[PDB]
């Protein structure tokens, strides 16, 4: 018959090795996989480090180099108030820019042609936003505007080896104003660390921001890198990688297929044998959930390893999607190391006791996030014009999140007890709202989970 | 008989469609309801949002423009300690609205008259007020005072496209100082995002305030704001929103009444069949509490709504109300939702667990309530003159709180040791009042809330 | 016989209004003393804290008068490096104390003779102190010193309506240099507010101090306030709340008398009747506890009152002492709330539970002491030297009970990352100490705390 | 035969006092050793934070006496952008070496000769390093490099009672520059608290670092400190804890040796008398784990403490590992007082309930430690880039372990909501990150260590 197969199928490894002898492959390969991606991921992240904080840094001279009166701590106040500021800001840049060779520490070339667009072949671009028609007269409330946006731009090119001091800013009808320059470094330590060539260009862009129109008009200053090559064993561990992950995702195919016939092979004998009906979940069974997750993580490495090369090579420049593909790829595989603890008993009775938990424990989380909800939208909406924290619904998600969870509580309560919200029903709010959030969540919700999990390790030990 | 009514009252609504086979009305048009209270709740938070980050830049603008010497994060520390540190500021102040035009970067207009009762027709009024009778003197402790206020202004006028030069103040018996002018400016960002008509009016106080007397006199800059028109479907919405609640009022409403009188059928056929005794809580179950809560969000939302649409039509700008009317409501409806899940009875034991556990925890509520109001006074009176977290009684209340949730809690202990409360008396009662408390209410008290849950959870699963 | 008299002992209240129908007396006498003396000390407290303010307020501007170049938040930094700043610091205070009446906000008057001891009559006395001998030679390690202070004084005198500027300072043998002089001012607020009459006077003591001669020479300004009358209710409610405590102290007294007095008789029937023996304990169920604490709590407050009376009438200024005398009692009587509720069943089993799990608790508490004092030596000794949280013992206390508690644990590993103890061997023990410590206090030890209240409540629930 | 031998042994102290009335004497010399050693321990902290502050005292003033314009708190920050800065804060240092005697606040000597090995008999050395071939061209990607490193030093010589001005600095191929030299101070304190000799010396390092060539050169000054003797009890207390734990050592090994023996005589006894077998955990039963304690302490107090009298005469200085034997060999003792509190019932039930929970609680930690390292690993690769606290891999492990207990929660999210990782989708993935994490490790893991431990006290109190 094939109760013989059927009992092969779902026995433990251990047991699968006394009948007919087969040798433990996936076990083994699997610990390898997770060697591999794991050294992997460190060094992909041991050299993205190095390139961050070269980035970093240059972006934080640049700042000092540019901005006038610039401190460190100051990036999300810098702003200018009055007309004069804006002017000064505007020409130290632009000041700094021309004698950047003889002042600077590092060592900046100029990018001829590197304004953007703007530029008609000069290195730096002073532009200026306005409407076309401003026309505004708060005097007797009169608006005649046209929102169509005027681009008026200054060619400045660098000295070898000023028109732009006659700029007339049109505050009435402004909307900002943008500085665009691009400057090529070498990063050294890469042609004596690693003997790597690469050439970074950094896009520098200052803004003088006035879409507001609220009187203040923040300065800040952002870079944009492109790393190229100024004219190994990490591409074949990447292969390595590659193949460790090929291979494991064909045998864990191979067994998921095993898996599907021997649904297919039992759906009818028991439908013939006995003629019983067999229900969906009844053939998940024959579904190896360990399996799922192993080829969903090689499919992550080989597809972010993939990308990776690019990287590595200059040719993508994709870093955000290779690191989560990776990410969690390696988070998968971890995980995974489960599995293997589930052979012993000792061990399967914590990891039983969570996995009889699970389903209690998402079915309270649906009827607490109603609750959870509500409040965050009542906060939003009555303590958002008072309150730092509430100011949108995913900083009031975070503030809840963290308050049930015993952190940043005082601040919390400290906010609105300053100005109060200028109001005391709104005060008087705050009180209510907090202190019965808290005391719900933490008293009543929290406690539920305790018991939850508590009554699943009882059964588990207590069959 | 009426078995068979009582029957079909207290029944699922699953099995109600059974019986006489009712469309379900008020469950979709409660789901219907809670999409469009959540949905106008959203757009309302999103506009009030926008008015106000434009107030609150434009009154970091006046700081700036206004205030000698200001800097941001100096606000509760901005003070003035000298005869001459006061005039420059009050002067500064006074110069800056006289050039306001030629240095501001936002299109500010004088409002003529705007310096309030004590302008004579000035747009900005500079006075000072004292007591009629100071003669303070601390050399022989003589102090013949009349407490009678002498409101002493001056009328400033601005340029058209110096007699507060000549001020002099009563400083030994002065009481505060006061600018008060009004701007006018106009949100550009409505008439391009929305086509809008928005011209704000700022009503600017500056107060020097002296009412310590206590040799230093802090200065604050507040405004307020007249938002008017210068010179749809948010309405449509609304309307469809006050239908569907006033629909659900009157359905919520009926099905209540329905209730009463079937509670009045029953108080007296067993009064005749049995002649038994009925308890006013052996006819709450004829109250449907979900009915209660249905009508009550209802009646919330209508009438915050009416308010909103003053305000959205700039007659009102009640929005604290509004805001409160509007939150509570939508918290309401969301914690609603509960109703539904407790038709499922895996649901139904963690909704009921909560239920069953809820009186226990309101009566230890009660039980410790009075420890931590003795603690509360306690650390008021004692350490209130040492601590900064120890102020104020409500002050008090939000650090013990936080500290119980563990919060906050290596700060309180570090404020005791800076100084020691300038005493060792002191600082040891702060160590046993501390570590008492945090001990007793983490250790114990939070112990116990777990048991009664964990208790109410063991009945709820072993009935 | 005495089991009707031991039967009416031992009864509840309620009960005990049924047998001879005597009036609750001391439970109304309770109720009235829980409301003056809470009443009391909220009135002691609003009152402090205005003084607290003023005494606050006024010594902020004494720092900005007379602190050469402060700013606030820099009072543990302020320090000079250098001698000419020293001799900059010192002067400006003296010459800013010479302009005081021109150019302070405040109304300070000159207390003739006020400098001290140091002072022949002056105002203002400037002292340098410095070793008899000093002859510090680092350049051969020479060390002539003899230990004797001597103390060189300079008087100043202030102006009707300059011998300090030729001061020399002996700074390789120095010591400190202190400014001494008063300033006397008038609470106008009092004389407005409760028609009050209140003489401040402030003692201003100036430290340069180098007594750790270690190149930098912190400075601080401190004040002693001296609240006299410059030339009713709330003493008739402190009468009133003598009385009250007075009337309950006697009556719990000879309540606890009438307990041993029956504890006497049983001692001896029990030895008659049937010769058996009763151990102590078996006559402490005689003792109300609860009386004990009424009759302390009336002692608190009779004598914290009666400091109150003195310091109200300006003769004790004992604030400290009078402050914990009044807090510790009224939490006492908050905390005798508690036996009204043992009345009741419900709240009962509550009150019982924490009763009966409090003997595990005191013993779990002593086993995990002498754990939790061996990780405070072992994290003083080796983290002492490089983490700011484990300078002192009661420091390394007060940090290692808010970890467990969940609270300010990043910012301690984070202190440990910064120079890493300039070690990698003391980096890689922080990571040890800390991550055993935590794991093992939160997920073990915070663990038995639960189960033994969670154990009690069983007992509680199911005798 | 032995049962009596084997009975005397595994027998309570109490007991054996009973049989053969034998004196408890490792028992009082185990208490004895407790308090000599915590008083060492605590001796040695006491004189060791002294030091602490004079050396970290001084080098706050060296900060400020040679460091241009430094204010403290911007430490990691101190960075020079601009060749002209660079410059003038590398004259201010050695221009302010120069007239140190005349203008700092302590007593410093120039050490002659004390510029380190680049100095030629000079006192303070001024070295530029660079490469010998730089020939940097971002212009056209051209990078002819020799990174052999070239040190050009320069000699300053003190005053008695400028070649470094002409000093250029060869920017583009720059890698640091360095100020060595030394200074001599007598910690005067000594030579009146405890008439104790101590010359100090500083070996002051001021590094402009330019090793990453990223524009920025940061600047910090480091100490080195060498405490000599200017030209007891503590001592003899030494030798009394090193007799005090040598006579421990002797009496816990002897009381080991006879478990070794008696185990020996049994494990034949047995296969004669039954022949029966006996497993290596069986044995265990012999070996009294507190002894292996007692043992291992003596160990490190006689180990810690000869390092001790080698550091106090002044001829050692390791106090790092000196203070981690000390505080380890504490820890351990005060640990040791557990096995007294194990000879009385009570307080067994809840050291006994720890230690059958300990292997559970042990195997659940390997379970959810791979949980936790792919979390680590996942959160490091993706969030390394934006966030400051998942920079390296120690870092995300100390920040995700602060979450799950609570603390530095609002903070984490706050950091990804303020540029969102100037990305959407690493936003999202931030969030999906964190919510599950807290969720999983706090809701569930965090449950399931409370229900070990219930669990383990369950069977405890009801075998
Ligand atoms: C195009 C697709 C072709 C795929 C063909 C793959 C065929 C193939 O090799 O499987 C046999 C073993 C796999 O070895 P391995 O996966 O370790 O062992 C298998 C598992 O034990 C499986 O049970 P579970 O995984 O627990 O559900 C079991 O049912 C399989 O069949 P059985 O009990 O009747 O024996 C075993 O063969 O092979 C190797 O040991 C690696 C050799 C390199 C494989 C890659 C060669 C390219
Ligand atoms: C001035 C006041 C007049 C109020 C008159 C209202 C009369 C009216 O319509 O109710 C019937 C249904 C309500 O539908 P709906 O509320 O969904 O259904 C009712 C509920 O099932 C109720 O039980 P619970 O709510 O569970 O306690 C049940 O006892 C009622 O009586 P029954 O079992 O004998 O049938 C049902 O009619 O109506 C509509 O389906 C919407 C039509 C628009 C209603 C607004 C018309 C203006
Ligand atoms: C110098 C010392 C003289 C002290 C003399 C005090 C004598 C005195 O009055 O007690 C009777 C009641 C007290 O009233 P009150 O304290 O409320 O009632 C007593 C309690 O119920 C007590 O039980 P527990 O407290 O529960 O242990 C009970 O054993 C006493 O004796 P009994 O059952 O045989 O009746 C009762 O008299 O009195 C007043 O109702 C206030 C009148 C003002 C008392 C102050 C007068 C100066
Ligand atoms: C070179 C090595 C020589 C080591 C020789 C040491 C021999 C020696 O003294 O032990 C006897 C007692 C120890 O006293 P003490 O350690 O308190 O008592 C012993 C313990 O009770 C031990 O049981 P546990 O520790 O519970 O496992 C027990 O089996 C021993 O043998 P017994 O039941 O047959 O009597 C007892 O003698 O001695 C002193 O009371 C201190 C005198 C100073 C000892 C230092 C002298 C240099
Ligand atoms: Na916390």
């Known amino acids: 018959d094939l109760r013989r197969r059927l009992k092969y199928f779902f026995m433990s490894p251990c047991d699968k090795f006394r009948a007919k002898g087969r040798k433990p492959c ?14 992997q991921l460190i060094l992909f992240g041991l050299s993205n480090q190095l390139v961050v904080t070269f980035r970093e840094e240059n972006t934080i001279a ?51 042609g590197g304004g953007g667009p ?66 090529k470094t070498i990063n050294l330590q890469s042609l004596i660390n690693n003997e790597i060539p690469d050439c970074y260009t950094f896009s520098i862009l200052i803004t003088f921001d006035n879409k507001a129109h609220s009187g203040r008009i923040p300065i800040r200053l952002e870079t944009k890198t492109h790393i190229q090559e100024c004219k190994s064993f990490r591409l074949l561990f990447d292969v390595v990688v590659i193949l460790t992950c090929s291979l494991s995702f064909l045998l864990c195919a191979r067994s998921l297929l095993r898996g599907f016939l021997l649904q297919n092979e039992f759906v009818v004998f028991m439908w ?12 998940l069974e024959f579904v190896n959930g360990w399996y799922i997750l192993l080829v969903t993580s090689d499919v992550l490495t080989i597809s972010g390893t993939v990308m990776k090369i690019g990287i590595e090579a200059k040719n993508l420049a994709s870093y955000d999607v290779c690191s989560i593909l990776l990410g969690t790829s390696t988070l998968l595989v971890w995980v995974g190391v489960i599995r293997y603890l589930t ?26 996030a109603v609750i959870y909800l509500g409040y965050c939208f009542c906060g939003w909406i009555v303590l958002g014009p008072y ?31 300053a ?39 009882d059964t588990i030990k207590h069959p």
Chains 1, 2, 3, 4 share one sequence.
Request: charged content about 15%; proline content about 3%; glycine content about 4%.
């Open 26 to 39: 996936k076990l083994m390969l699997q610990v390898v996989k997770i060697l591999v991606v794991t050294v």
């Open 387 to 417: 309150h730092v924290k509430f100011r949108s619904l995913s900083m009031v998600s975070e503030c809840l999140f963290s308050l049930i969870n015993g952190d940043d509580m005082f601040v919390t309560f400290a906010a609105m007890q």
């Open 272 to 283: 013939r044998r006995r003629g019983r009906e067999i229900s969906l979940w009844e053939r």
């Open 343 to 368: 052979f012993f008993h000792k061990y399967n009775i914590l990891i039983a006791t969570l996995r009889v938990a699970l389903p209690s424990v998402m079915r309270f989380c649906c009827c607490v």
């Open 419 to 457: 100005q109060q919200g200028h109001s005391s029903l709104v005060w008087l709010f705050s009180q209510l709202y907090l202190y019965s959030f808290i005391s719900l969540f933490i008293y009543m919700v929290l406690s539920l989970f305790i018991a939850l999990i508590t009554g699943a390790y």
């Open 118 to 183: 703007w530029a008609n072949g000069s290195a730096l671009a002073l532009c200026q936003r306005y409407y076309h028609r401003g026309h505004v007269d708060p005097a007797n409330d009169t608006f005649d505007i046209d929102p169509r946006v005027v681009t008026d731009c200054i060619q400045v090119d660098p000295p070898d080896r000023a028109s732009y001091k006659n700029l007339t800013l049109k505050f009435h009808k402004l909307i900002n104003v943008t500085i665009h320059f691009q400057l």
């Open 62 to 112: 640049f700042r000092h180099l540019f901005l006038l009166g610039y401190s460190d701590g100051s990036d999300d106040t810098f702003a200018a108030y009055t007309q004069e500021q804006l002017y000064q800001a505007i020409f130290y840049a632009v000041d700094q820019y021309l004698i950047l060779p003889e002042i600077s520490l590092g060592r900046y070339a100029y990018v001829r």
